[PDB]
């Protein structure tokens, strides 16, 4: 649904994330819990983490960060053809955890902020717009599987 060139911009900056998936996951997840702390309620196990340094020292949060980015990277590498990868993820997020689409929008803002905080030279306005379009595709399709399972997304 994006252009070939737009996916090349998405996958180019994603290459920068693969050089440090753990660090990126920590910054994204911490950025998510600082900007929208209601999302932290979806993590009973991160309740005892009061400070940003505690969060950065939680191996469990680092591991949860790598699991999500690993799945996001597998989805973006399909360049839109992600039905087989996006449906199990939707199920995990609906039936198990009830993650509203609004919360996938929050982490997307966190991703954008972090990617542009670390790699502005490889994340100008064309790259941002490309990535924003990849993430919107991912959210808009997760929400269709959500409905398909009977979960509206709120």
Q: With respect to ligand HEM, which residue has the nearer C-beta, 64 or 112?
A: 64
Q: With respect to ligand HEM, which residue has the nearer C-beta, 56 or 73?
A: 73
| CA–CA dist 126, 153 (Å, integer) | 29
**72 in contact with ligand HEM (CB under 6 A):** yes
CA dihedral 108, 51, 56, 67 (to 10 degrees): -40
Please pick, from the candidates 89, 94, 115, 130, the single residue that binds ligand HEM as defined by CB under 6 A.
Answer: 89
Range list of H helices, 39-124? 52-57, 59-77, 83-91, 101-118
Q: With respect to ligand HEM, which residue has the nearer C-beta, 121 or 143?
A: 143
How far is the first Cα of the chain from the last one, in angstroms, to the nearest whole number? 25
**Which of helix, strand or coil describes residue 117?**
helix
Residues numbered 9 to 28 that lie near ligand HEM (CB under 6 A) are none
Q: Which parts of this chain interact with ligand HEM (CB under 6 A)?
A: 39, 42-43, 64, 67-68, 71-72, 89, 92-93, 97, 99, 103-104, 107
């Amino acid at each position: 649904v994006l252009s070939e060139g737009e996916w090349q911009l998405v996958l180019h900056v994603w290459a920068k994330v693969e050089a440090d998936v753990a660090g990126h996951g920590q910054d994204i997840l911490i950025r998510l819990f600082k900007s929208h702390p209601e999302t932290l309620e979806k993590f009973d196990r991160f309740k005892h983490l009061k400070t940003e340094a505690e969060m950065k020292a939680s191996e469990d949060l680092k591991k949860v960060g790598v699991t999500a980015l690993t799945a996001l990277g597998a989805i973006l590498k399909k360049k839109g053809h992600h039905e087989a990868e996006l449906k199990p993820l939707a199920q995990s997020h609906a039936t198990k955890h009830k993650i509203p689409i609004k919360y996938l929008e929050f982490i997307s803002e966190a991703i954008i902020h972090v990617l542009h905080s670390r790699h502005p030279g490889d994340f100008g306005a064309d790259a941002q717009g490309a990535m924003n379009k990849a993430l919107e595709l991912f959210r808009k399709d997760i929400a269709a599987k959500y409905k398909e399972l009977g979960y509206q997304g709120g």
